[PDB]
Each structure stands twice: as structure tokens, then as C-alpha cells.
Amino acid sequence: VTTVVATPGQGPDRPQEVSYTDTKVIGNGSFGVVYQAKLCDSGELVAIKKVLQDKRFKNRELQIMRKLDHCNIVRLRYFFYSSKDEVYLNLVLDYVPETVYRVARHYSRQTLPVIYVKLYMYQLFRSLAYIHSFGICHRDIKPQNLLLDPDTAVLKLCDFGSAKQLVRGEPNVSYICSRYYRAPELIFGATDYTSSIDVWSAGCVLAELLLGQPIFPGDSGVDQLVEIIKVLGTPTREQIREMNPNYEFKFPQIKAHPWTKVFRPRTPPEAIALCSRLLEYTPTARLTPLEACAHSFFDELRDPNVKLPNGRDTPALFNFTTQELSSNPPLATILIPPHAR
């Protein structure tokens, strides 16, 4: 049994003794270590991210997660410090048994039923609308960071280790996101990008779930843009200017592949329409996450008599808060169905 003095993720700084056991290393990398463990008083499994923390400043990931409380974001239960002589921050997270990456991989070996594509994407856009309302850009949207509870079909966004509150005028690094999900303005080297890069990445996830494989499987930075161009066609000079004005060059003119021919023969037209409004070259032309939630692709989720394939009721889908609606409050006319009032 390991006992630490841990501070709850929510509320004021009120540290308390927390004991946990059965710690196993699940992942490793440059970020640090991710452990699985069990809380003794409750028996619940948790996940622990261990990163080295300097004592002279606050951990950016920690400060972001402490302001988040949302059904579709992984909860920070506790954080505590531990250890030659270095001090590590440990983030104690809720444990969700599955990720989107693993579930999609099974179908990549057939296609995920579209009811689940609606369910998972809807919750992802909800989580994006929530964090974007704080000015926070996740910057690592990809299937591996989408936790799933298969029993309840609840999705939870995690890994805020790349996240940042984007502030106008402060440039940011362009080499962000996993390659398959990187927005084209990032590939062009734009440093003044906005939270709309998350919407691009979310568009790639949606297309991947419809297609059964990543839509833009680039093998490198430039090749990633080539894969994008081979689907969307060559971006126009105006679209390039919106992404990065420093490209006055002339690129070969590749024709856009017909969107309805990109996906499977019976892909719902609403799904293809949503993809095209997310995977827009011009960053400001993409839907916001809240607009995405209100898209007609998710109308079936607002049906009072909607049936899930697991035989259970749908999770919380319409418990929007003022903070979540702040980018466009009148969208609640669509987002909250009459039976949810």
C-alpha cells in the first residue's frame, strides 16, 4: 500500500491522505510515465501520470485540468508530488477501460456502426466546445486520446499535456498534433493558429471512423499535406493565404476527389456534409465544436425514442451549461430537445 498526501482536483487546496496499490506501468515516453492503480478506500481503478515538475512554476497541464469539470473530459481525482532528489507531479485520473483507437483498430481488421460514430463524435465536440470556451486548445486530438466506456458509450477526452490557452499575438510552435490529424496550416508552418486546429483533427477522427482507416495517412510532414491535397484538391491561393500568407508560390493544381466517392457507398449524406465542413482549408471556415454538435448528423441523438445497440439509455447528452454554450447560446434551441427541458 502506497499512501500519499493528495489534493483533490476540484475545490480548494485541501490535501488529504490517499492510499493506493497494485501499480503497473502502462505507458512510457518523453512525457513521463502512466500508471494504473487502485484506490484502497473505494477499490476503483485509477490512472496516474507521473511527470517531473520544477518547483519554480506551476505545471501547465495541472492548472488546465483543475478548471475542467465536464462529463466528456477525464476527471482529475487527485494530484500529489513524489520522487534521486527530483520532485515529480502525479495526476490521478479516472480509469476508463477502452479508447477509440483500440475500438477502431478492430474494425480496421468492416466499419463501426454509424450510431456509435454519432455518439462518440458528438461527445468529442461537446468536450471541445467546453475547453475552447476557456480559450484552451487541446492540440493533440486523436483516437488514442479518446477514452470510451463500452458499457455506457461515454467518451472522455484525456491527455492535456499538449494543451495551451492560445492568446492572440503570442506565437506557438507549428509542429504539434499527431501527423495524421495535423491541420494543414500547421504543416504550412503557421504560428498564429487558433483552436480551430482541434476541429480539423476532430474532422480527421470522424472521417477515420466512417472510412475504417485514417483519411490522411501521411508518412512525413510534406507527405501529410500531399495526402490532404489528394482528397481535397490543391488549396486555392486565397485558402493558402488564410492558412499562411507567406506562400506566394504556385503549386500544381490537383482536382478534389468527389466527397461522396471518398466514403463507402452507403455512408449517410449528413456524415459526408459534416466532414466537409470540418476539413476546410481556411481555418475560420470550419465549424466550431458547438456548431458541430448542432449538425444534422447528430439529429438521431436528439430523438426521444433513440435506441443504443447496448440496450441502455443514451448517456448525458443535453446537460449543457452556460459555459459550454457561451460561444453561441442560441444553439441551445437545437442542442437541447424539447423533451430535455
Binding site: 504550412f188 499535406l225 500531399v226 491535397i229 490543391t234 508560390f249 503549386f251
Partner: peptide, 16 residues
């Protein structure tokens, strides 16, 4: 900025 565009133009013609 000039180096990226050159490689991009090159790779686009192989698919064009």
C-alpha cells in the same frame, strides 16, 4: 518557407 514549397511542388507532380 521556400524549402517547404519546393518539396511540396515536387511531390504534387508525382500524383498529378
Amino acid at each position: 518557407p521556400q524549402k517547404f514549397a519546393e518539396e511540396l511542388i515536387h511531390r504534387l507532380e508525382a500524383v498529378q
